[PDB]
Design a protein around this ligand. Structure first.
Ligand code: CLA
Ligand code: CLA
Ligand code: CLA
Ligand code: CLA
Ligand code: CLA
Ligand code: CLA
Ligand code: CLA
Ligand SMILES: CC(=O)O[C@H]1CC(C)(C)C(=C=C/C(C)=C/C=C/C(C)=C/C=C/C=C(C)/C=C/C=C(\C)C(=O)C[C@@]23O[C@]2(C)C[C@@H](O)CC3(C)C)[C@](C)(O)C1
Ligand SMILES: CC(=O)O[C@H]1CC(C)(C)C(=C=C/C(C)=C/C=C/C(C)=C/C=C/C=C(C)/C=C/C=C(\C)C(=O)C[C@@]23O[C@]2(C)C[C@@H](O)CC3(C)C)[C@](C)(O)C1
Ligand SMILES: CC1=C(C#C/C(C)=C/C=C/C(C)=C/C=C/C=C(C)/C=C/C=C(C)/C=C/[C@@]23O[C@]2(C)C[C@@H](O)CC3(C)C)C(C)(C)C[C@H](O)C1
Ligand SMILES: CC1=C(/C=C/C(C)=C/C=C/C(C)=C/C=C/C=C(C)/C=C/C=C(C)/C=C/C2=C(C)CCCC2(C)C)C(C)(C)CCC1
Lengths: 143, 198, 154, 158, 142, 33
């Protein structure tokens, strides 16, 4: 009872159709993640990715930062998250500039306009997510 | 509101009886929703009348409601109709609310034809099989008897809402209803909060 | 048809159900059966291990299953509920898929399966049935005596 | 001066396309920031008059801000410096969101990218920006040469 | 800009342009609805309609915010943030991307009251009631 | 003075980062048509 078969019935492609690669759970989770979800605009993809990453980026800096044992621990963590997000979106912009040099299609992550929209969504979402995480950690007594 | 069953009645002069004209707030969908709300209110008011009678009379299950917390049906049956609900343990109240929640969700979802506003019959719950008429007592009858029986359901439901609103005010507005003022039984709060304090 | 039939009882179905029910109803029944079996196996393993080995929460949570969950903080319960809800929306999407195979998040209709696959599926099903009975027994014993499974066995 | 623009462009042919350089978009944006900065230094002047800014000889400590406090160094950072720096950090964060984020509303920064042009020069805001930036360079010139500070010069001149 | 719900040529110091008119009308409707709820809440809290509780009994509308910031207003902030995140998905996609949708239409019509013969009436009533509440609240809060 | 605080991060983090970004983009620029 074989469970590892050729990828898309192609023995000569460098891949295997394992349970990890091809199972229904993997397909569902991957295809429903924002980067692969159907119908989402590049702005919406970038926005979702941005809030998801900016929400959790604050935590390492807040807990394990140099000023963890200081009254300004959370503020310093938020500023660190903002700086890291600035670096991340600068990386995104230069990546778009290097990769999608000539393009006129748009509405596609592999085009200049689409990648710019994705980066804009990522920046706004990450800033908002870091701010929301700051608010939650300030009001941690609620939970 | 002219095809609905409650349209014709001897007491309403055979009129639809919509003074405020609320049937025209929307299409047939909002009127179907209003009829479903009326039927659910009448049904809950019927059950409330029966439970209120069973409570103001001495009729309770024998034993301990919550052996862990020492709350007993006897304690509930001697604090008036409504403070009994407060006396129920919070987690038991949550298990009543959750069961009613799941039943309501099933009512909204599982109709094969569709929503009561969008194809289903308002008040129809028998797609949850044997939820109604578990005994199946109504299987003998035909549609023509069921028509008059649903008309009587609507009328008795309206009367039951009237009665429960009576008892719920007489608690709150003193002597709200003449003849429902003595209160040999009607004591305490008139309207309880859900989950006691939240 | 399906895989549940086994030697001790054969095709156990005294009360109909299987016949006069839609294929969707049969798929729903098997999905519910597998979900019950899997959750019951998890519950049995959790109770058995947590009776005598509970290092989390500074080892202060009681061995009683029906009171340990009461003592667990609210945030932990919320996170467990969120995880289970995520698994269940994945199950709902799998149901919406056009090639659903009740309970099969692995796919398994896209591989050259043989009778050994059916035998292993039956092994899962029977272990799930045994756990379904056992977990309810464990919970009832915990409610009655106040002791957990292994503490009761002591 | 257009000849100098062509000489630049020519030399730096890349920075040119995004509007970075001697471009009307760049001149407009600075001018906006220079007008806001005249407003800003006036706001700090009246805030310091009304003792708005937590201020004095109070200084930060290593236990509150760590190595950025610079406690033990010759530099003596004040709480007024800290709070004004926090305000500027908020300004920078909002600006960064407006720039790298959606062109939600208003005006772009990088020449609207998309191969747009620079519209050579109400539309008098560029003249005001000329005014504001020449005032600012004059203020630094006096602060460097006459050595008469900045807030003091603003107060005595006004 | 010449045809809209309750539309007249009331644009002194004008700002509304074909690009931003939909965003501006969304902002108008959102502010209006928040104003009706704020006016209703303030007038109720002043009149005497109050939650059952000792924490609420001693509070007034001016002092309620500081007392309720810890738990109650924080829960309200969480819920409002969730709903506004969904609304912000729709609005960001509409303005800064591609979308065919009107202003203020979040799909919150489950009762199908917009199927009535008079639905433009409801839209206009929402607009003027929002405006009237947004000005009454300006009076009472200040 | 305050010049160390103003200049050391400016010249050791912002300027080298921008230089790395510019160099990366420039080396990744493709041939003109
Ligand atoms: C090559 C010589 C040289 C070197 C190695 C340094 C080194 C230093 N300077 Mg700098 N500095 C220099 C010349 C130099 N300086 C000159 C001539 C001036 C102008 C008066 C300054 C003015 C100055 C100030 C005001 C400050 C420093 C500071 C510093 C320190 C931090 C770095 C910084 O951001 O400062 C760089 C700041 C500048 C103004 C640099 C100006 C431009 C120089 C001359 C460029 C040298 C380029 C070199 C010849 C070629 C590079 C080749 C390439 C392949 C790498 C560091 C020890 C800071 C300090 O004291 O921290 C404790 C500080 O506050 N320097
Ligand atoms: C790799 C080993 C290592 C580790 C574990 C640490 C750890 C730490 N260092 Mg660092 N450090 C290291 C190497 C390391 N250091 C080295 C080599 C140097 C010399 C240059 C330094 C120099 C240094 C300094 C100078 C300082 C620190 C500090 C710190 C602390 C905070 C740093 C911070 O903000 O991180 C931020 C980290 C992140 C934003 C992200 C980390 C990665 C995440 C958590 C990974 C998650 C992966 C996930 C599971 C993937 C799958 C997910 C999927 C299933 C959904 C922390 C205790 C600071 C401190 O205060 O120390 C007490 C400090 O001042 N370090
Ligand atoms: C919506 C109406 C309603 C509500 C909110 C309550 C609430 C209450 N009832 Mg109940 N009760 C109701 C209707 C209602 N009843 C009806 C219709 C009946 C007639 C069967 C009863 C008969 C009844 C008795 C005999 C007792 C209670 C008791 C109680 C209290 C404790 C919970 C309990 O054990 O309930 C039990 C409730 C039920 C089993 C009926 C639930 C309602 C469904 C719709 C009917 C199911 C019928 C089916 C044949 C079984 C609580 C205040 C106990 C108490 O402490 O009284 C003082 C108690 O001993 N109720
Ligand atoms: C609730 C869990 C559950 C569910 C959903 C199913 C579902 C199924 N089983 Mg069953 N099964 C279960 C538990 C369950 N089983 C357990 C624990 C055992 C061990 C005794 C078995 C043993 C078993 C065998 C040996 C076989 C099946 C088969 C089947 C299939 C056909 C019968 C049917 O339609 O049943 C419908 C079932 C329900 C609607 C569940 C509710 C039933 C009643 C209304 C209430 C519960 C009964 C009773 C009161 C128990 C609780 C009391 C006490 C023990 C606490 C179907 C997929 C056959 C199959 O797969 O053939 C291809 C088959 O051969 N099952
Ligand atoms: C139905 C599933 C279920 C439920 C509701 C609970 C509930 C509980 N378990 Mg857990 N537990 C489970 C399965 C379950 N368990 C399983 C499968 C195992 C075996 C690995 C354990 C092993 C275990 C231990 C060792 C301890 C708990 C404890 C606890 C408490 C909270 C911490 C926790 O969940 O850690 C669960 C941690 C895991 C690694 C489970 C993984 C679940 C898989 C991946 C799904 C709570 C009473 C603590 C307690 O209070 O004990 C008295 C404790 O110390 N559980
Ligand atoms: C001149 C360059 C430069 C500058 C200005 C800074 C500045 C800073 N770094 Mg450092 N850092 C640098 C280079 C630099 N870094 C390099 C090259 C590395 C990699 C080896 C690191 C690795 C590093 C870590 C791992 C951490 C810092 C952190 C910090 C902060 C220290 C806060 C405190 O009180 O202590 C501060 C913003 C800490 C922080 O909070 O960052 C957000 C921190 O955790 N830095
Ligand atoms: C593990 C993977 C993963 C992760 C990490 C996420 C993460 C997220 N998903 Mg999900 N998603 C996933 C898988 C995942 N998803 C899958 C597989 C599916 C398929 C079912 C989806 C489908 C999906 C959808 C359809 C949507 C999401 C959305 C979201 C986001 C929820 C935001 C929200 O409204 O929170 C709740 C809100 C809050 C917690 C905020 C609370 C309020 C705070 C406390 C106040 C802040 C105040 C502050 C000062 C600001 C003031 C503003 C103003 C007054 C000026 C979040 C980033 C939503 C989204 O918006 O994405 C774009 C969304 O619509 N996801
Ligand atoms: C489609 C649809 O609608 O489907 C469904 C959905 C819906 C609505 C949900 C339905 C339902 C009803 C269902 C299935 C309800 C299930 C309810 C369930 C399962 C309720 C468990 C309670 C357990 C408790 C309270 C335990 C207490 C336990 C206590 C008090 C203890 O701590 C025990 C203990 O203290 C002792 C005694 C002694 C001490 O030494 C030790 C400790 C402290 C440990 C319907 C009607 O079927 C329809
Ligand atoms: C001066 C004056 O009067 O002042 C006061 C005093 C006064 C009068 C007390 C007041 C009051 C209260 C009032 C009027 C209260 C009224 C309450 C009312 C009217 C309560 C109905 C309950 C019906 C139920 C529960 C039915 C269940 C029915 C069921 C479940 C079945 O029989 C099932 C069934 O399968 C059988 C078994 C046989 C089948 O053939 C038929 C079907 C399928 C259906 C007022 C208004 O305050 C005024
Ligand atoms: C001589 C000559 C030439 C020439 C020339 C001439 C006359 C050139 C003159 C150039 C001139 C006069 C250039 C000034 C720029 C000033 C700027 C950008 C200032 C911005 C400053 C800003 C935006 C500051 C903002 C703030 O800080 C403020 C104020 C307050 C703080 O809260 C923080 C903020 C950020 C808000 C040719 C023609 C070129 C050819 C050849 O070369 C020969
Ligand atoms: C799958 C899985 C997993 C994982 C998980 C994860 C990965 C998670 C994550 C999570 C997360 C990570 C989350 C997040 C969240 C977020 C949020 C919730 C956010 C929000 C935000 C907001 C709301 C914002 C807002 C805003 C904006 C947008 C902009 C402007 C500003 C503001 C603020 C307004 C595990 C391992 C467990 C295992 C099992 C499976």
């Amino acid at each position: 009872s074989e469970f590892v078969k050729p990828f898309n019935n192609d023995p000569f492609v460098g891949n295997l159709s394992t349970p990890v690669t091809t199972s229904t759970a993997t397909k569902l989770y991957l295809g429903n993640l924002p980067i692969y979800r159907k119908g989402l605009s590049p702005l919406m993809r970038g926005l979702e990715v941005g809030m998801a990453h900016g929400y959790f980026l604050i935590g390492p800096f807040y807990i394990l930062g140099p000023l963890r044992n200081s009254p300004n621990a959370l503020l310093v963590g938020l500023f660190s998250a903002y700086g890291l997000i600035i670096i991340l979106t600068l990386a995104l912009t230069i990546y778009g500039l290097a990769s999608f040099q000539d393009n006129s299609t748009g509405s596609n992550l592999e085009s200049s306009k689409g990648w710019r929209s994705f980066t804009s969504g990522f920046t706004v979402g990450a800033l908002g997510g870091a701010s929301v995480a700051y608010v939650l950690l300030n009001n941690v007594s609620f939970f | 509101v002219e095809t609905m069953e409650g349209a014709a009645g001897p007491e309403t002069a055979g009129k639809v009886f919509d003074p405020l004209g609320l049937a025209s707030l929307g299409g047939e969908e909002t009127l179907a929703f209003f009829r479903h709300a009326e039927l659910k209110h009448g049904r809950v008011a019927m059950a409330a009348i029966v439970g209120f009678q069973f409570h103001i009379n001495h009729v309770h299950f024998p034993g301990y409601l919550s052996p862990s917390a020492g709350v007993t049906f006897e304690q509930l049956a001697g604090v008036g109709p409504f403070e009994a609900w407060n006396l129920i343990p919070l987690l038991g109240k949550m298990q009543i609310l959750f069961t009613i929640a799941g039943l309501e969700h099933a009512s909204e979802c599982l109709d094969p034809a569709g929503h009561y506003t969008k194809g289903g019959t308002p008040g129809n719950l028998k797609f949850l099989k044997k939820f109604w008429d578990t005994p199946g007592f109504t299987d003998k009858l035909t549609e023509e008897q069921k028509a008059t029986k649903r008309v009587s359901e609507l009328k008795n439901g309206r009367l039951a809402m009237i009665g429960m609103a009576s008892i719920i005010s007489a608690m709150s507005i003193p002597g709200s209803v003449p003849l429902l003022n003595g209160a040999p039984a009607l004591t305490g709060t008139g309207f309880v909060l859900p989950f006691g304090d939240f | 048809d399906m895989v549940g039939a086994c030697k001790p009882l054969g095709f156990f179905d005294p009360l109909g159900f299987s016949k006069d029910a839609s294929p969707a109803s049969m798929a729903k029944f098997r999905e519910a059966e597998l979900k019950h079996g899997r959750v019951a196996m998890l519950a049995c393993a959790g109770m058995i291990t947590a009776d005598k080995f509970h290092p989390l929460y500074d080892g202060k949570l009681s061995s009683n299953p029906l009171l340990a969950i009461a003592q667990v903080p609210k945030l932990g319960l919320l996170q467990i509920l969120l995880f289970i809800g995520f698994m269940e929306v994945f199950g709902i999407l799998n149901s919406r898929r056009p090639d659903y195979k009740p309970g099969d998040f692995l796919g398994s209709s896209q591989w050259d399966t043989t009778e050994v696959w059916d035998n292993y599926q039956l092994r899962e099903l029977n272990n799930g049935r045994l756990a379904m009975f056992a977990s309810i027994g464990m919970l009832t014993h915990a409610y009655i005596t106040g002791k957990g499974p292994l503490e009761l066995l002591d | 001066f257009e000849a100098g623009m062509a000489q630049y462009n020519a030399d730096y042919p890349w920075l040119a396309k995004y509007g970075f350089g001697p471009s009307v978009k760049a001149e407009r944006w600075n001018g906006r920031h220079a007008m806001f900065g005249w407003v800003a230094i006036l706001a700090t002047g009246v805030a310091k008059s009304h003792g708005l800014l937590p201020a004095g000889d109070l200084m930060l400590t290593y236990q509150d801000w760590g190595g950025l406090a610079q406690q033990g160094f010759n530099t003596y950072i004040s709480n007024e410096r800290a709070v004004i720096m926090i305000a500027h950090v908020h300004a920078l964060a909002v600006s960064f969101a407006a720039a790298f984020g959606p062109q939600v509303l208003g005006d772009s920064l990088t020449l609207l990218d998309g191969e747009k042009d620079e519209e050579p020069y109400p539309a008098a805001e560029i003249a005001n920006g000329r005014m504001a930036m020449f005032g600012l360079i004059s203020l630094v010139c006096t602060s460097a040469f006459t050595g008469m500070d900045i807030l003091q010069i603003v107060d005595i001149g006004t | 800009l010449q045809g809209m719900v309750g539309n007249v040529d009331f644009d002194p110091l004008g700002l509304s342009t074909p690009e931003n008119i939909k965003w501006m009308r969304e902002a108008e409707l959102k502010h209006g609805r928040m104003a009706q709820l704020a006016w209703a809440g303030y007038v109720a809290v002043d009149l005497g309609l109050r939650f059952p509780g000792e924490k609420y009994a001693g509070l007034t509308s001016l002092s309620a915010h500081d007392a309720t910031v810890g738990y109650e207003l924080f829960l309200l902030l969480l819920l409002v943030g969730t709903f506004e995140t969904i609304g912000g998905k729709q609005i960001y996609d509409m303005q800064m991307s591609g979308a065919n949708r009107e202003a203020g239409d979040f799909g919150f019509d489950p009762l199908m009251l917009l199927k009535s013969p008079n639905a433009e009436k409801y839209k206009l009533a929402e607009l003027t009631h929002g405006r009237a509440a947004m000005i009454a609240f300006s009076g009472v809060v200040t | 003075s305050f010049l160390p605080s103003i200049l050391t991060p400016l010249v050791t983090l912002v300027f080298p980062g921008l230089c790395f970004a510019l160099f990366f983009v420039l080396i990744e620029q493709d041939e003109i048509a």
